[PDB]
Design an enzyme around this catalytic site. Structure first.
Site, PDB file in Angstrom:
ATOM      1  N   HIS A  52       0.834  -1.197   0.000  1.00 32.94           N
ATOM      2  CA  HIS A  52       0.000   0.000   0.000  1.00 32.94           C
ATOM      3  C   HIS A  52       0.867   1.245   0.000  1.00 32.94           C
ATOM      4  CE1 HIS A  52      -1.903   3.410   2.058  1.00 32.94           C
ATOM      5  NE2 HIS A  52      -3.041   3.009   1.522  1.00 32.94           N
ATOM      6  N   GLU A  53       1.869   1.283   0.872  1.00 29.18           N
ATOM      7  CA  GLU A  53       2.732   2.451   0.894  1.00 29.18           C
ATOM      8  C   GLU A  53       3.511   2.534  -0.403  1.00 29.18           C
ATOM      9  OE1 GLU A  53       2.342   4.740   3.003  1.00 29.18           O
ATOM     10  OE2 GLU A  53       0.855   3.541   4.076  1.00 29.18           O
ATOM     11  N   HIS A 110       1.758   4.483  -3.104  1.00 26.12           N
ATOM     12  CA  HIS A 110       1.801   5.935  -3.036  1.00 26.12           C
ATOM     13  C   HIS A 110       3.090   6.468  -3.642  1.00 26.12           C
ATOM     14  CE1 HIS A 110      -1.894   6.825  -1.080  1.00 26.12           C
ATOM     15  NE2 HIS A 110      -1.637   6.095  -0.010  1.00 26.12           N
ATOM     16  N   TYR A 154     -12.687   1.501   2.200  1.00 27.59           N
ATOM     17  CA  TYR A 154     -11.557   2.343   2.570  1.00 27.59           C
ATOM     18  C   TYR A 154     -11.041   3.106   1.358  1.00 27.59           C
ATOM     19  CZ  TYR A 154      -7.078   3.805   4.526  1.00 27.59           C
ATOM     20  OH  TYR A 154      -5.995   4.539   4.954  1.00 27.59           O
ATOM     21  N   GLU A 166      -5.674   7.159  -1.829  1.00 28.60           N
ATOM     22  CA  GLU A 166      -5.768   5.826  -1.254  1.00 28.60           C
ATOM     23  C   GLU A 166      -6.340   4.844  -2.265  1.00 28.60           C
ATOM     24  OE1 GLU A 166      -4.160   5.349   1.496  1.00 28.60           O
ATOM     25  OE2 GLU A 166      -3.813   7.512   1.484  1.00 28.60           O
TER      26      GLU A 166
END
Lengths: 534, 529, 248, 529
Positions: free
Chosen positions: A447-448, A451, A489, A496
């Site tokens: 997930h990070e 980004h 989410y 996100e």
């Protein structure tokens, strides 16, 4: 058992044992020469008379120190033992402006950033009394935290100068701890006693909320699931304590949420304080090496027995740097980076250290084998082109170093499972916490990673302008249609969402991949089009 | 740290006294204390030994070396056990002789290693020359060879050496003297020099059955006819037809095992003639004729009360001795040797040994030794002789006869019968105590016509290549089939045992089979044949 | 007899198998160890860093797009070799980069180790010291002592053909006009001094040259790093931080 | 780390048991533990050995030296592998003799090293004298040599020594005795002293093919005619034409490798006559006649259950034994020796070994051994004989004949035919079982005219220098070409293998080839020539 025991003690038969029952010899070998002394004390530890005698023999040694205690010392110590609750009357009297009426009629129960206990504090204030009001709520959060010295110490890891709180509070905190540091001037070292063991009950949820959720057998809470246990014991080898340990003197029954029973040995050189209430305060910044991890039975309930030996923190610190060098050298060859780069630097100062380091050797293995090789290299090249480094920690994100400086606003603080700083191009992974959504740790990384990758893709389109893939009208619209066809989410916002979509499209379970295909067909061809740029 | 080993022989003290065994773990061998349950299923032997003897047997191989296999690979298997002395036992076997005058009597001979009685440690053999007439017309040797009162005959025999012991000899070969009669030494066989570069492993021949046997007469220039022999001597030989071969114990050097590199080199310092005396004075000796009715001698290490060092050896009870030296076992806890129960054997003891065992039998209140067998202590120097109880024996403890009743059952299996002969199948051991057969024909009214009616005309029984004995009638017949004057006439076949045989013509030179003790062996009428 | 077996035995009996690719990583790291650490800090401080490739050095992203023309290289012995076959190249530019091809034979043999050390000396003289012009009269003075000396084959060992034809002694002007030739002589000397087996050869044929380099690597390299740092403003400013803080 | 090594043989314990291999790294050789995936592609052999034996084979070269090459560079390649004993095997080859009376019959001989059945560890050979008549007029040897009833013939032969083993002999050269018939020892050829200072590497001759062979008769004054021989001996020789050469095993010293300087020096302490006994009692013996119909003997180290130390040797399966001892390989996973599948060979076993293998075949429930080949365990002391299934053999396991069908098939390639002879190209192995050819001419109406119509006139087939067989008619003709009474007459040719040959004239001295079983080999009409 007896048979095996017999063969080992008799010198001539020891060799016979080792040849035909290797495993039996190994068990008995470690048993009769370190664990047996540990076993003796617990038998005596059942007789109340012996416990009382031990407590008394400890008193006189600390009699002189206690008799010389001043009022300021005792008063300070009292605050450490009891958590201090914030007083409402003080905060209300500290605002006095227009914001409170504005605050009066706000949809309180709509902020995800707030937690349950903080909502209650707000609800008590509310009984008394998608826009710009949630930013004012961010400031208030940095003011409603309880005054808890011990809590501050692990979040900051001992780096007391952290600009994470108001300056006045910062000055207040620094003075109290330094004063306490002077109080612990007496070393335990004496000629009156040898090996002393002390105990402390601790909640598993404090070390790893990811394992704590399935540690206890789903049906009968008195048994422990062997499968999860085997993972937990695997790499638990050493730990460091930066804060103030509150330990007991005689073992006492534990509360429901405490399933760890620590047995800590001390060194004559360790500095420490005596308490009249049967507890001891150890100096901060102590290092501990784990010798064994086992399951024990007590009062019909299962527990985890953990022993430990105090050693100089520097001795453990040496292990972390050597671990730092092994992991960075290995990945520079696999990636193609310059020989001397400081990429995977991690700084950890907490109780679950050893698992964090070893878990690096697993997140990256799953990270490479699952993503197209050319994407990693290209993105890693981008990352090195700047000063960014990966950082694995066990302290709260707002306290590492990089995060606070660049944001610059005090209220701009953010803590969570992961975080990406574009300005510094760094990826942060806080091991100890548990994702309220993520299933494991690998997903937290991806997930990070999403980004970060998104920033380079936007960088390649135009060099002068700093922008993300979103904000281009050919994607904003796309988020308005399919944006709500996956997890709730990701529906939060575009940033996100891209990150959310990226892990799923590259999940290890092909089923998940199929799901995103049949639920957001447009996004699926779009993502394949930004990654093409290589 | 000490793990004491005073004897300095590799095995520690406690192990040697209580019992140990070596057992191979996948590829590595280690020595272990005896565990009752894990070794018995593995077929391992429980060893014991002396904590104060570099070699409990006292022979040149250490307690450790024997059981581990680091040893001259020629030592026989049963001697690998620490309590059985390993040493050589060489005697001489003479295969055939030839005679002439300084018309050549060339006859084949058969020899058996002998032992007679207060019997002592010295090897001797005994040849007996066959008397049967290979040639019909060769009646009276004195004339077939032109021997005159003032003539001299030459003797030329073939011999091979047999090692029936438990260890190899290397360089030397024993001296051995031929003797006729009681003390008339005809010749001493030279000790050939630098010629026995080969090896005599136990149960082997030198030279092997595949090579020419060593000619006794040199055939060189050493002596033209070393074996002269006056007339009167020849007469002595004719009445007894027997010779004796006495051999001494001068063997070679010893083959030792070197630990550094595992090489077995014959060391010129250690010599068997220094060791044998030790063995012979500290062990109990057991002689057994069980295997093939040949005297096999083994020695077991027993304690000798009078000597401190000697009380260290493990007590050895007779019952175990038979088990480890020869192969006795316990299928049902009853001692037996390949089926034959221990009770079918005699026990004879030297006068010394007899006295000792009589004492031991008194404090136990028993009369039959076969019961209390596992309670008999061996002391040093007893000599015991175990012979099959069913056979008759002569003065030299050679198998010579048997009870007639036993002889008959061995023939009760007629595989086939015709007018040309029998092809029987007899137990290999009996046909070495039968000198020959008497064939006779019986008239329908009780008459009796014996075909081969001469003392020296008995050898009519050959052996076929499948171990089936075949009796040929046409040999000493008229090369004619077998005639029967009446299909109702019975055909009787008789066998003649050694003890009851005649070896020379009688007083009045009788050649008839009259005064010969004859055993009934067969009786089928003409119809059956 | 029992004594000798051990020495042969140890050398031949590799107890465990490192692995197929570990050996590669271990070989390169051991090689760079022998060079004094202080040199590596100067290299990093001036920018680019060494990255070890595994395949044909001729084809790598960093080097493929630049200096295609310079396919002709000269080994330490002066013989020409094509770049593709060759196992180590370096390039001087805005991004100083040094690339070494990984191999498992750098400890065992030496001819390959010599070229790597040779390349480190060329980067040091042309790219590092040149920022301070460190090669100067002392280096020139030793240099001059070699040319005029009794039948000293030392010249043959360090000078190229161009040098063997300058009739008079070396002059401070020449180094300025021509600075590639002199920098080369430095590089060779640097290489021969580091490699143990060649150390004796160097000191034997060029005593003064050996003496110069001995005192240089002994206590004249820490001075190189500090003076280099004296050009960076931030180095001066970090220096101010430390000095002011302690005695404050 | 003190890696453990009890056997003190350079290689550590763990390595020997599990598998290792030596591999040259550019110029440096190092020993490595076997890695399955990275070594197999390089064609390296997986070694195994005994962790408790300085020399698993028990011969004088340590486990480490064999695989590393520090060894007498003469040891044959196939013996470098740790499980193949390296030792010498010397037998005598006699090329030709000459005879006379104390007009010299000089005939060329051919010898083959023999092996017969209950076969024992002793080398022997067998010569066969050519019977063909070199001279037309030399009918009946008894007259060509003036031999009288009271005469004696003198024998003078030439011999060479052959080493077919795997290791060198150095100083001494063995004694060997000639014997005619069953037991008539004519002479023992002296062991010349201090003269065999050269070396016999495996598969070499002494003296080499380029020098005169060692004359058997001394030609000096030692004995005027050492090979005396009464008349009767000469008669057996005339009937049999066979002589046996028995040789013993007294070889020299051993060459050892010195670590200090890499010098190979002959040590005067260690002698092969001390080692061979070890090898012969701890190895399985495999005899193979595959290459050129000659008996090649190899010994493989096998386990012996009864002995602790001996269970240490790596288990050896039969299939692998053939692979490493002789050169068998697996092109398609089928065992084969240069094309010939393993199935074209017989397996014969001694009675012990036979019995043992019957057991092995029972616990696996199989009947054809050719299948379960990779599951047969070898124990010590088994003896196995692998012979070509297609040829007939005699009692001494020599190639002697074959099935007619094979004989015909060997001729289906007629390279050329004319009236002067045939020039064939036959597989080199067949022409060792063909004694000669009978040529005959056939009238157009079935008559039969045999050209060389004498028993002793068959050697008419020579061999050209390019390996093409050439049959010459003019040899035993009248030096005239071949005539044909009809261009339509068929010419038939028969071949006679040794086994089916006659070696002496018959009862009434018949010389015709009548009662000889002849196989037809060629038949082309007169015009098809």
């Amino acid at each position: 058992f007896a048979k095996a025991f017999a063969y080992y003690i008799e010198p001539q038969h020891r060799d016979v044992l080792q040849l035909y029952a290797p495993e039996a010899f190994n068990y008995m070998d470690k048993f009769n020469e370190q664990e047996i002394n540990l076993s003796l004390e617990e038998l005596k530890d059942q007789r109340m008379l012996a416990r009382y005698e031990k407590w008394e023999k400890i008193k006189q040694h600390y009699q002189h120190w206690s008799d010389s205690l001043s009022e300021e010392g005792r008063g300070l110590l009292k605050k450490l033992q009891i958590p201090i609750e914030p007083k409402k009357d003080d905060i209300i009297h500290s605002l006095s402006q227009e914001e409170k009426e504005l605050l009066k009629r706000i949809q309180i129960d709509s902020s995800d950033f707030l937690s349950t206990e903080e909502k209650e504090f707000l609800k008590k204030l509310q009984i008394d009394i998608s826009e710009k009001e949630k930013e004012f709520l961010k400031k208030l959060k940095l003011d409603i935290q309880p005054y808890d010295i011990n809590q501050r110490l692990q979040d900051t890891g001992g780096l007391i100068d952290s600009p994470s709180i108001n300056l006045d509070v910062r000055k207040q905190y620094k003075r109290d701890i330094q004063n306490i540091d002077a109080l612990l001037h007496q070393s335990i070292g004496s000629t009156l006693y040898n090996k002393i063991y002390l105990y402390e009950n601790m909640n598993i949820n404090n070390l790893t909320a990811t394992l704590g959720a399935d540690l206890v057998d789903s049906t009968d809470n008195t048994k422990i699931n062997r499968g999860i246990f085997n993972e937990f014991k695997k790499n638990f080898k050493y730990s460091i304590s930066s804060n103030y340990m509150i330990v007991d003197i005689n073992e006492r029954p534990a509360l429901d949420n405490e399933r760890l029973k620590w047995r800590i040995q001390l060194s004559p050189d360790t500095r420490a304080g005596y308490l009249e209430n049967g507890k001891l305060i150890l100096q901060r910044n102590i290092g501990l090496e784990i010798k064994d991890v086992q399951i024990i039975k007590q009062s019909e309930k299962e527990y985890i027995r953990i022993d430990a030996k105090v050693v100089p923190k520097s001795k453990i610190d040496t292990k972390i740097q050597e671990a730092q060098l092994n992991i960075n050298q290995e990945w520079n060859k696999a990636l193609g980076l310059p020989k001397y780069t400081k990429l995977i630097t991690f700084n950890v100062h907490n109780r679950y250290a050893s698992n964090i380091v070893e878990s690096a050797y697993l997140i990256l293995n799953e990270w490479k084998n699952n993503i197209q090789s050319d994407l990693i290299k290209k993105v890693t090249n981008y990352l090195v082109d700047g000063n960014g480094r990966f950082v694995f920690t066990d302290i709260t994100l707002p306290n590492i170093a990089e995060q606070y400086t660049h944001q610059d606003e005090i209220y701009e603080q953010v803590h969570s499972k992961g975080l990406y700083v574009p300005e510094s191009r760094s990826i942060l992974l806080h091991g100890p916490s548990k994702g309220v959504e993520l299933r494991n740790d690998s997903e937290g990384f991806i997930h990070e990673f999403g980004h970060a990758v998104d920033d380079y893709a936007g960088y390649l389109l135009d060099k002068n302008q700093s922008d993300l893939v979103t904000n281009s009208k050919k994607f904003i619209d796309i988020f308005k249609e399919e944006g709500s066809n996956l997890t709730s989410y990701g529906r939060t916002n575009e940033a996100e969402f891209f990150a959310e979509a990226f892990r799923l499209m590259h999940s290890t379970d092909h089923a998940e991949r199929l799901k995103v295909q049949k639920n957001a067909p447009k996004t699926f061809q779009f993502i394949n089009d930004q990654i093409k740029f290589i | 740290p000490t793990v004491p080993d005073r004897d300095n022989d590799g095995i520690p003290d406690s192990l040697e006294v209580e019992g140990y065994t070596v057992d191979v773990k996948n590829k590595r061998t280690f020595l272990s204390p005896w565990i009752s349950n894990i070794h018995e299923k593995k077929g391992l032997t429980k060893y014991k030994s002396s904590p104060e003897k570099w070699s409990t047997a006292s022979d040149p191989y250490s307690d450790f070396e024997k059981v581990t296999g680091r040893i001259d690979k020629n030592v026989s298997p049963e001697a690998r056990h620490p309590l059985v002395a390993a040493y050589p036992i060489v005697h001489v076997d003479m295969e055939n002789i030839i005679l002439s005058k300084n018309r050549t009597i060339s006859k084949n001979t058969s020899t058996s290693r002998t032992h007679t009685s207060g019997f002592s440690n010295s090897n001797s053999s005994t040849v007996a020359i066959d008397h049967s007439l290979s040639l019909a017309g060769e009646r009276t040797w004195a004339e077939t060879m032109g021997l005159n009162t003032a003539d001299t005959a030459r003797l030329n025999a073939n011999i091979r050496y047999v090692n029936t012991g438990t260890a190899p000899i290397y360089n030397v070969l024993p001296t051995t003297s031929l003797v006729l009669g009681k003390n008339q030494t005809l010749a001493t066989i030279k000790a050939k020099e630098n010629q026995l570069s080969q090896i005599l492993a136990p149960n082997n021949y030198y030279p092997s059955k595949n090579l020419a046997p060593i000619a006794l007469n040199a055939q060189d220039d050493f002596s033209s006819t070393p074996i002269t022999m006056n007339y009167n001597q020849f007469l002595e030989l004719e009445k007894t037809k027997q010779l004796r071969l006495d051999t001494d114990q001068v063997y070679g050097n010893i083959a030792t095992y070197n630990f550094e590199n595992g090489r077995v080199r014959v060391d010129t310092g250690s010599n068997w003639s220094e060791v044998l005396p030790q063995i012979q004075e500290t062990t109990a000796r057991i002689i057994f004729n069980g295997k093939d009715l040949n005297l096999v001698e083994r020695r077991i290490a027993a304690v000798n009360p009078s000597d401190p060092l000697e009380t260290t050896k493990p007590d050895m009870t007779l019952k175990e001795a038979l088990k480890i030296a020869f192969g006795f076992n316990e299928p049902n806890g009853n001692l037996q040797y390949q089926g034959k129960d221990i009770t079918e054997f005699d026990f004879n003891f030297d006068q010394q040994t007899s006295q000792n065992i009589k004492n031991q039998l008194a404090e136990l209140n028993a009369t039959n030794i076969y019961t209390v067998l596992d309670k008999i202590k061996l002391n040093a120097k007893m000599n015991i002789l175990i012979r099959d109880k069913r056979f008759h024996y002569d003065r030299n403890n050679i198998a010579v006869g048997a009870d007639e009743s036993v002889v008959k059952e061995a023939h009760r299996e007629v595989i086939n019968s015709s007018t040309e002969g029998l092809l029987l199948n007899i137990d290999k051991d009996i046909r070495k105590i039968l000198s020959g057969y008497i064939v006779e024909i019986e008239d329908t009214e009780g008459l009796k016509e014996v075909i081969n009616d001469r003392y020296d005309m008995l050898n009519i029984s050959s052996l076929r290549q499948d171990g089936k004995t075949f009796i040929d009638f046409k040999k000493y017949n008229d090369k004619l089939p077998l005639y029967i004057s009446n299909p109702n006439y019975k055909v009787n076949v008789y066998a003649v045992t050694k003890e009851n045989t005649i070896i020379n013509p009688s007083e009045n030179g009788d050649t008839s089979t009259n005064g010969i003790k004859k055993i009934l062996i067969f009786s089928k009428k003409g119809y059956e044949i | 007899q029992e004594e000798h077996l051990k020495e042969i035995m140890k050398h031949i009996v590799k107890i465990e198998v490192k692995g197929e690719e570990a050996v590669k990583k271990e070989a390169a790291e051991k090689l760079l160890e022998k060079v004094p650490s202080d040199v590596l800090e100067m290299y990093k401080a001036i920018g680019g860093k060494i990255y070890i490739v595994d395949g044909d050095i001729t084809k790598h992203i960093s080097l493929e797009a630049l200096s295609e023309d310079k396919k002709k290289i000269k080994d330490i012995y002066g013989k020409d070799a094509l770049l593709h076959e060759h196992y180590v190249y370096a390039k001087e530019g805005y991004e100083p980069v040094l690339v070494i091809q990984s191999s498992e034979d750098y400890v065992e043999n030496t001819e390959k180790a010599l070229n790597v050390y040779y390349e480190i000396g060329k980067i040091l003289s042309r790219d590092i010291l040149s920022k301070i012009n460190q090669p100067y009269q002392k280096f020139l003075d030793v240099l001059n002592t070699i040319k005029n000396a009794s039948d000293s084959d030392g010249q043959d060992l360090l000078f190229t053909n161009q040098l063997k034809e300058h009739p008079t002694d070396f002059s401070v002007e020449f180094l300025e006009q021509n600075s590639n030739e002199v920098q080369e002589v430095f590089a060779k000397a640097f290489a021969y001094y580091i490699e143990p087996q060649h150390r004796d050869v160097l000191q034997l044929y060029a005593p003064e040259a050996f003496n110069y380099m001995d005192k240089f690597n002994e206590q004249e390299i820490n001075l190189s790093l500090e003076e280099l740092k004296d050009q960076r403003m931030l180095a001066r400013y970090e220096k101010w931080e430390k000095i002011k803080q302690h005695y404050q």
